[PDB]
Amino acid sequence: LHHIQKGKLIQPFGCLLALDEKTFKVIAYSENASELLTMAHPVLGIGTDIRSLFTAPSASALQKALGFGDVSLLNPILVHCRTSAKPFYAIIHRVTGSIIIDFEPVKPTAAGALQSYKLAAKAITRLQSLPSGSMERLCDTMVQEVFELTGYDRVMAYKFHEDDHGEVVSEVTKPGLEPYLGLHYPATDIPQAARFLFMKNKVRMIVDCNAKHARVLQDEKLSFDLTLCGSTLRAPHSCHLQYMANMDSIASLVMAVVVNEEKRKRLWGLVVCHNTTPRFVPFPLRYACEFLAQVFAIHVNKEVELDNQMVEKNILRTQTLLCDMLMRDAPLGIVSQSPNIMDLVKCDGAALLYKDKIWKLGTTPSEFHLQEIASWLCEYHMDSTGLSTDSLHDAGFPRALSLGDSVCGMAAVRISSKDMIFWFRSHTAGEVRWGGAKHDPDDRDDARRMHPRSSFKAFLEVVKTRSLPWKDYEMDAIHSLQLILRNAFKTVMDKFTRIEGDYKAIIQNPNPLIPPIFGTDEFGWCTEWNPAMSKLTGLKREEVIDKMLLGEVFGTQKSCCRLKNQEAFVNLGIVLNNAVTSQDPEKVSFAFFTRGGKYVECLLCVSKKLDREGVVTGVFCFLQLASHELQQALHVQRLAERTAVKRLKALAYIKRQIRNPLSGIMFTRKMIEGTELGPEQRRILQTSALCQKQLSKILDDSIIEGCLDLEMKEFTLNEVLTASTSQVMMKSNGKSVRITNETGEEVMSDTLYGDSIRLQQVLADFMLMAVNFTPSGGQLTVSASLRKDQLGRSVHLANLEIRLTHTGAGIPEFLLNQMFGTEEDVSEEGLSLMVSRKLVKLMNGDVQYLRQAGKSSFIITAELAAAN
Amino acid sequence: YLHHIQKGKLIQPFGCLLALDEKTFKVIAYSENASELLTMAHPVLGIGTDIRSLFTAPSASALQKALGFGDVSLLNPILVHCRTSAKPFYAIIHRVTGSIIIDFEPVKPYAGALQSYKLAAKAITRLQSLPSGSMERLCDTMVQEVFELTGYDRVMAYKFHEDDHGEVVSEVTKPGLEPYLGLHYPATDIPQAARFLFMKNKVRMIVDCNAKHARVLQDEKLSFDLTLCGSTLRAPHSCHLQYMANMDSIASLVMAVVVNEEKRKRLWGLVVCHNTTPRFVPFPLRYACEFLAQVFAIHVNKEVELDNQMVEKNILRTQTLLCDMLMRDAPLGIVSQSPNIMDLVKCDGAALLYKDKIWKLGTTPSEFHLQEIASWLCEYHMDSTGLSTDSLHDAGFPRALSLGDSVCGMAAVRISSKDMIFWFRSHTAGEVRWGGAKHDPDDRDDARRMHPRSSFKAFLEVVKTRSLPWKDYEMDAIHSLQLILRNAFKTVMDKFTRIEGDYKAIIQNPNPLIPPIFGTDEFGWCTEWNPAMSKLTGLKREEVIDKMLLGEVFGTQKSCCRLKNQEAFVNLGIVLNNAVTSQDPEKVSFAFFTRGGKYVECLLCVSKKLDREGVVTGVFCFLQLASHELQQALHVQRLAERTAVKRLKALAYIKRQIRNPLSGIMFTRKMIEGTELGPEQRRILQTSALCQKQLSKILDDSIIEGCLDLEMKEFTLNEVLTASTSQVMMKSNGKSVRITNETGEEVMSDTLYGDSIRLQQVLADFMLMAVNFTPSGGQLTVSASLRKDQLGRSVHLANLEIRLTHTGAGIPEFLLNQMFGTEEDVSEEGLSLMVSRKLVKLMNGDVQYLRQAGKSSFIITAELAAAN
Ligand SMILES: C=CC1=C(C)/C(=C/C2=NC(=C\c3[nH]c(/C=C4\NC(=O)[C@H](C)[C@H]4CC)c(C)c3CCC(=O)O)/C(CCC(=O)O)=C2C)NC1=O
Numbered sequence A: 001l002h003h004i005q006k007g008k009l010i011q012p013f014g015c016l017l018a019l020d021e022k023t024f025k026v027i028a029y030s031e032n033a034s035e036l037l038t039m040a041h042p043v044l045g046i047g048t049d050i051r052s053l054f055t056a057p058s059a060s061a062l063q064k065a066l067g068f069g070d071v072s073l074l075n076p077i078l079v080h081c082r083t084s085a086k087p088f089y090a091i092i093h094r095v096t097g098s099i100i101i102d103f104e105p106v107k108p109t110a111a112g113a114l115q116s117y118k119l120a121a122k123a124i125t126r127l128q129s130l131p132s133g134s135m136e137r138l139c140d141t142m143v144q145e146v147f148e149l150t151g152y153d154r155v156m157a158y159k160f161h162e163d164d165h166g167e168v169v170s171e172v173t174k175p176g177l178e179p180y181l182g183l184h185y186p187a188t189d190i191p192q193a194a195r196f197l198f199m200k201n202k203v204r205m206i207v208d209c210n211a212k213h214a215r216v217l218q219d220e221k222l223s224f225d226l227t228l229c230g231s232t233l234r235a236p237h238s239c240h241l242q243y244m245a246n247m248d249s250i251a252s253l254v255m256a257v258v259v260n261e262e263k264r265k266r267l268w269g270l271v272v273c274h275n276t277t278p279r280f281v282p283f284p285l286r287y288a289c290e291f292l293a294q295v296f297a298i299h300v301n302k303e304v305e306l307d308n309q310m311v312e313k314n315i316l317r318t319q320t321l322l323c324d325m326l327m328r329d330a331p332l333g334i335v336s337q338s339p340n341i342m343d344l345v346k347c348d349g350a351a352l353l354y355k356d357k358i359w360k361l362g363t364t365p366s367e368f369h370l371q372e373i374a375s376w377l378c379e380y381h382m383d384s385t386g387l388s389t390d391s392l393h394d395a396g397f398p399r400a401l402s403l404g405d406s407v408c409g410m411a412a413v414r415i416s417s418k419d420m421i422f423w424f425r426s427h428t429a430g431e432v433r434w435g436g437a438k439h440d441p442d443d444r445d446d447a448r449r450m451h452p453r454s455s456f457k458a459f460l461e462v463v464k465t466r467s468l469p470w471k472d473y474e475m476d477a478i479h480s481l482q483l484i485l486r487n488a489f490k491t492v493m494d495k496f497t498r499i500e501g502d503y504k505a506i507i508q509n510p511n512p513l514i515p516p517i518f519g520t521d522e523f524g525w526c527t528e529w530n531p532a533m534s535k536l537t538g539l540k541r542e543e544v545i546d547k548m549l550l551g552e553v554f555g556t557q558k559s560c561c562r563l564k565n566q567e568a569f570v571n572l573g574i575v576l577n578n579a580v581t582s583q584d585p586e587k588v589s590f591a592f593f594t595r596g597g598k599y600v601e602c603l604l605c606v607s608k609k610l611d612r613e614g615v616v617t618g619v620f621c622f623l624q625l626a627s628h629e630l631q632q633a634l635h636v637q638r639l640a641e642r643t644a645v646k647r648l649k650a651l652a653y654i655k656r657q658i659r660n661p662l663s664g665i666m667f668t669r670k671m672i673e674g675t676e677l678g679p680e681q682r683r684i685l686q687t688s689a690l691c692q693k694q695l696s697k698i699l700d701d702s703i704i705e706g707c708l709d710l711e712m713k714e715f716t717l718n719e720v721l722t723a724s725t726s727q728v729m730m731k732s733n734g735k736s737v738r739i740t741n742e743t744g745e746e747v748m749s750d751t752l753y754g755d756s757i758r759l760q761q762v763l764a765d766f767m768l769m770a771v772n773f774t775p776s777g778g779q780l781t782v783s784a785s786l787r788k789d790q791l792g793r794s795v796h797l798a799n800l801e802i803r804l805t806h807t808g809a810g811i812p813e814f815l816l817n818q819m820f821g822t823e824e825d826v827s828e829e830g831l832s833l834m835v836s837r838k839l840v841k842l843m844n845g846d847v848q849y850l851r852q853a854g855k856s857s858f859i860i861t862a863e864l865a866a867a868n
Numbered sequence B: 001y002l003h004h005i006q007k008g009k010l011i012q013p014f015g016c017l018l019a020l021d022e023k024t025f026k027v028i029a030y031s032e033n034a035s036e037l038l039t040m041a042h043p044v045l046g047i048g049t050d051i052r053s054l055f056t057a058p059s060a061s062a063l064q065k066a067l068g069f070g071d072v073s074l075l076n077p078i079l080v081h082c083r084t085s086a087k088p089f090y091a092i093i094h095r096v097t098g099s100i101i102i103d104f105e106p107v108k109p110y111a112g113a114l115q116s117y118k119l120a121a122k123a124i125t126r127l128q129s130l131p132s133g134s135m136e137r138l139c140d141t142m143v144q145e146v147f148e149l150t151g152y153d154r155v156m157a158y159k160f161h162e163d164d165h166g167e168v169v170s171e172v173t174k175p176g177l178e179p180y181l182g183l184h185y186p187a188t189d190i191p192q193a194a195r196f197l198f199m200k201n202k203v204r205m206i207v208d209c210n211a212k213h214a215r216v217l218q219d220e221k222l223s224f225d226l227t228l229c230g231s232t233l234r235a236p237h238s239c240h241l242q243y244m245a246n247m248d249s250i251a252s253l254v255m256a257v258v259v260n261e262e263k264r265k266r267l268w269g270l271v272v273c274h275n276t277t278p279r280f281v282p283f284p285l286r287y288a289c290e291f292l293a294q295v296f297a298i299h300v301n302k303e304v305e306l307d308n309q310m311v312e313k314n315i316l317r318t319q320t321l322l323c324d325m326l327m328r329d330a331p332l333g334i335v336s337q338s339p340n341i342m343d344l345v346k347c348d349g350a351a352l353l354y355k356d357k358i359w360k361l362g363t364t365p366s367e368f369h370l371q372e373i374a375s376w377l378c379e380y381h382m383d384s385t386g387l388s389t390d391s392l393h394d395a396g397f398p399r400a401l402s403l404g405d406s407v408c409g410m411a412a413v414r415i416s417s418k419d420m421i422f423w424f425r426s427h428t429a430g431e432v433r434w435g436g437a438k439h440d441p442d443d444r445d446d447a448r449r450m451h452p453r454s455s456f457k458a459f460l461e462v463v464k465t466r467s468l469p470w471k472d473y474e475m476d477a478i479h480s481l482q483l484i485l486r487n488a489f490k491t492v493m494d495k496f497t498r499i500e501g502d503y504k505a506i507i508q509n510p511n512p513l514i515p516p517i518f519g520t521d522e523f524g525w526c527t528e529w530n531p532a533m534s535k536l537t538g539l540k541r542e543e544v545i546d547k548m549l550l551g552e553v554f555g556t557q558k559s560c561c562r563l564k565n566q567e568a569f570v571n572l573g574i575v576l577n578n579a580v581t582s583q584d585p586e587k588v589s590f591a592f593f594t595r596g597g598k599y600v601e602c603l604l605c606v607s608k609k610l611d612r613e614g615v616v617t618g619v620f621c622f623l624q625l626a627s628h629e630l631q632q633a634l635h636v637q638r639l640a641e642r643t644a645v646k647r648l649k650a651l652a653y654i655k656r657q658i659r660n661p662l663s664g665i666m667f668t669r670k671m672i673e674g675t676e677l678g679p680e681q682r683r684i685l686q687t688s689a690l691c692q693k694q695l696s697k698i699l700d701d702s703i704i705e706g707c708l709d710l711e712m713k714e715f716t717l718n719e720v721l722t723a724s725t726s727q728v729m730m731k732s733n734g735k736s737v738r739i740t741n742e743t744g745e746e747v748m749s750d751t752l753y754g755d756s757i758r759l760q761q762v763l764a765d766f767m768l769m770a771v772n773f774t775p776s777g778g779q780l781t782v783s784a785s786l787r788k789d790q791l792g793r794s795v796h797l798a799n800l801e802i803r804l805t806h807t808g809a810g811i812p813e814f815l816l817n818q819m820f821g822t823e824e825d826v827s828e829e830g831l832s833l834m835v836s837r838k839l840v841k842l843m844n845g846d847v848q849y850l851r852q853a854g855k856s857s858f859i860i861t862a863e864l865a866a867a868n
């Protein structure tokens, strides 16, 4: 499919013009150029002057752009015609021996690259604020932003695989369309020529797949072949036109995601948008989409760094567990205590075969099922002590299906010639919709076929009842444990029989995970020096035995491994003395110099070498090597955790210092209760009582997210209604807001059910902001009318209905949209608004104000229970 | 006179001494007490005796092994027995030119460097747990730890000044001892010989200044002398014994503090201990103290870097003050719109003489004073541009004495021939004791001055007519502001008469603080390139003007100043659009390569430019060349600032959430106070109001520890003494304790000076514990005392004394230790008690309890003023 370079067809929505390098004269054109640019008068032929089509300012601007160095920073370029002054978006690019210009009519906002970039600022800010560490959420966010920006029928992210076949990862459509999620596609749908072109043309748009194209009447006298690959007006393949017609998608717009893997540009995938009717999008929007795709790529680059850091942390955890297991008594200690061999490698069962005695943990086959497989391993693979398989049926076990489907994956190791230790992994499930690549290896770029595909279905692919594979480090760890156990109890090869290879001959992987280790006695003399530590330092063990660890071996001068300075010496002494009284593996930064010159930086962990008698015998230290990024991440995480835990003291002090005076307040109120007064004073005391009750209940605190346990108590509306006005009217009194006693007297004549604090929580806060924009001499209007509905068996319906005034300038739109939860940076003053809204709506109520003429009215309605 | 110390042949009588030869290992020098101490209960222990003929076989072998070792400072102390009667001994060895010197010290009846370092673990972890930032707390903690570890009569930190004289910075003494804190001493008190010798032997102990010194004998056939400087038994020079007998401090132990200032090293000071009775301290304690001094020196050197970081942070704040408000309403825009010129430098007032009008701010003399100052500058300083005067009387302008103590320090800058700006600093109060240095240069003490100084209590000196000094960058900022105003209006030196006279015409302050700025218009073309940026990047203004900022100037390839990679290109284009969209300055990390090819790392602050009509006209930004460590600190700080503010806003929401019903309760109380009530009800309501005010007073928001100040006002003690004690009697409702009136009637009857909002916070929360543990039937007694003494000049001391009985089980030892701030785990009640003790300890108030027979007794003392 190479004729893309040699094709004289363009889409019929813009004109294409070609100019030489120096004379700036027309050498090629399109059939619609004369109908569009000129009409709406010399005939547009070869060599016609550019100034005869556009006005003087437009021609001058185009000339200045043509003389510029990097033309990609200037387009789009607004121009006008001669007579009608019809505007156009000139898009200029340069090819070997020519300059090609595209013209598209305007108005079917930007004039450069930066102005065009400005249209994606909201989406970029949305992308930057995302919490880091999850690729799926990032893909969903980006696809949603693209859908909102472009206004297409559907948009989807389409990721490529190693096989070169692809799968959609996210999707956002309009209601009434068939979901495309989770469907794989053959690798031959997108030929390698297309995805090779997409490294340089990162945005492609097709307006109509059923339109009538226009040919490029190139001049015959020119000796140059005008390729059209870099232009925005290319007409696609007939094969692709039929492909798009089959899917019932007419117009399309697609963007590439090129990720710099180390550089190494790799096409991660595509962001493809479809619409069922012809659609045209102006050039600045396409440029903004391209910039957004660049930002998305530089974020998916960070996601893989996070993944690598997580894997490296897992390796470090395995090393720490191995160092733990080194000390305990072998071999039963690996299984009796915790953490045991199950935590060594991610598995589902484990078994030990020591001295014809079987120790089992987790989901393991029946004890009668272990000796025969052990004997089969012994007699079939005598030339190895380790084996791995993701399916026991493939490896040749005759009785694989007789043990059930609970366990299918094996990892076995021979510590001795008779005894064994092996892990079990449960068989996994899961199938893929559509064939991945439909299993057609080797390319088929023949450019002879017309379209060997049509329609679409589910096309499920079956599985082989397999388990997850065993990684490299998950076998290094098992080899390390084998070495430890073999040494403590008193070349070879490890099989790797995976599916579709049926056999492999990997060596034992003599790269054990055992870290550098040393250790001293209680006086300070060296006692241990590992082979790994000897490799790291270049110092033989015999050089550093019966030598003082502090000063002689590690020191600032005359020492074998010279330390940085005296602060390092002091810190090493402090750590070695602190570790005597603590067993926690205190990870401390440790940096030294090798025998030659190499600044080695690691983390050091020190523990006591306790003996059987219970008396310290020395220190056991091991040294784990981590890269700069993980060390910085650990430092930042430690600081963040300390800062987070610091505020707890302040919070507790605040709560106690608010609790004590309120307790004194109930003290003085209950003690003044003895001096009784008239009935009006009794109701005033009741109002103060539930006011302080609400105070304490606010200090008595998932309720931040709106979830409520719905605590229920029996109370009647009089005190709640009085306290709602009492808690707010001091604020309005400064603003000269009067009270009208408009509430009816029939609301209070009926008994009510519901708590006092819960009911009053979602009432008073509404009008608190009212004084903010209310001028002097305002008015307050409150009307209530309880609705008695006899719905239910034991609980009636006291449907609330309250109309509250809304005077002054009131809450503006950018403060009203905060109520519905449509904003991120919600002001702290407004939090109680949506808090009360969520509290009301948890009981299927409503609290809402609508803009009216003169003054608005807040409507409050709740399905509050009735105590009738 | 270091020569006298070198050849001293006298040692203290608490240990023996033996000097042997390098090769043969025979005694060549020995002390008189050695013969009767090492061989009690008798051969010739003269020259040539072998070392092995005095100790048992294991001890002899250990000594012989220790002699043949390169770095032997890691081995001492060495245990040694005697073959005569098995007498324990510490042997401490060192090597000098041609000899090996070993000194022996007897061991009390109750093994290396690392074991000696163990006796300081608690002190080291206490020093490490402190939060950084301040020095006084560090010095106090170090002195307290040394006092607890060594058990001496008094210890004190003694810091050296640049003059080589010193001053006492902290102190801790047993009760009954006169403090020395804050004093000063002449530089001739410590001869430079000892000061130089302290960089080798970092601990010096003297047991008895009155004992009879012993003498060592050395064979006179030697060709070289014997040096005893490094030995830990050397006898001090006689005039120092007289000096020590003057203060009646018989014994002493001093520890040098050597700070390796950036590997140059400097003696920061000493930690001097004193005792009135002869004292002896074993050798491992001296090693532990030496190690703790090393750790303290490291931490001291770590807290002088935060000072430099604060200096740099303050410098990167005067470049971000009035960068654009100057362009509108110049020069009147610097006084009217805040921040004003009073924020440029740390001053007390300002004045702006322009167009014959004064726009004074803060504290400033009358207009006639300013006119007289201006006329004096115009007359007597005709060829001056700006000056800073520490005290206006030293410069001697005629009318200095009229304003007096109101204004002393001045800083004047001259805008033009008539206008100018004044900054004013008031009189500061500062006094020293014992005199600053008692100057007597040229080493007046040499081979003389047996003891021409005797006991003296104090020596008060007063320096008059001085203000705080004007720094260098504080005048660079004024110079740069003068340059800004001179440029916007369209090489001269500045006086620095600061200390005593001899005006120093510094060269135009050769450091104008002005950051490198640039800017673009709306399309993107560069318009501004100031000389600072042109100097930083080595690029002329012409080569950049009329180009494009993105792509042509800052671009990945073929650009004037190439960027690092492509991720640094899409991050500069993002900020140039957010700056316009949001208009608020944004600070980001920047990095690039100059024309010469040097990597530059900066911070970029970018903000939007508007015209008079509020229309955005472009963008202007400037570079803040932060230092490496400052950049990393700000990076890590801003990494978690988002989470910090996210928690802060959530915490602050509850403030309003609880203030609203607090407003309701105040409303109800205020309208219930409007009814007819008896005296008892009135007193109840007054107590309720007093106990309620503390909620709002606490909710004003540091709040945990530090930055705490107590308000002061005139009040009667009856109200608080009743409200605080009444509000707790019913807290233990389930125990029914008995409370009866016990306070003295002479403490209620008087009014005084002091806030009642924190008196409840102090003496009402203390009695919460008394009901938590005491069972039913507990009796509580409160004793009050108001000592009215006139121990002052303008304030009458109405000192408050509180006594509380402690029934029940009482506070255990671990809970008690929390009150003193010496524990990591502090309970909420313990945290509140510690906070209250700190809150009362600023004005010399002691809160404690002592356990007696039956019930313990509390003592609370607070120095309080009287408003009589
Ligand atoms: C949902 C996934 C999806 C797929 C797999 C898809 C395929 C696709 N077809 C693409 C490319 C091509 N696809 C083909 C041809 C074929 N596609 C098929 O279905 C056949 C295997 C083959 C016809 C022989 C050719 C020649 C191209 C080159 C593009 C051109 O010259 O116009 C592209 C590239 C984007 C574009 O140029 O518009 C896409 C995105 N379109 C989709 O919507």
Ligand SMILES: C=CC1=C(C)/C(=C/C2=NC(=C\c3[nH]c(/C=C4\NC(=O)[C@H](C)[C@H]4CC)c(C)c3CCC(=O)O)/C(CCC(=O)O)=C2C)NC1=O
Residues within 6 Å of the ligand: B005, B158, B185, B188, B189, B190, B191, B194, B204, B206, B235, B236, B237, B238, B239, B240, B243, B254, B272, B445, B449, B450, B451, B452, B453
């Ligand atoms: C509280 C401040 C304080 C000061 C200023 C003080 C001075 C001092 N005097 C000290 C040292 C000396 N200072 C001197 C000399 C003189 N001191 C004086 O008062 C004269 C100026 C001079 C002799 C008359 C000498 C001979 C020494 C001891 C040197 C030696 O014995 O070889 C020291 C160091 C401690 C020691 O070396 O044992 C101290 C601490 N003692 C204090 O406690």
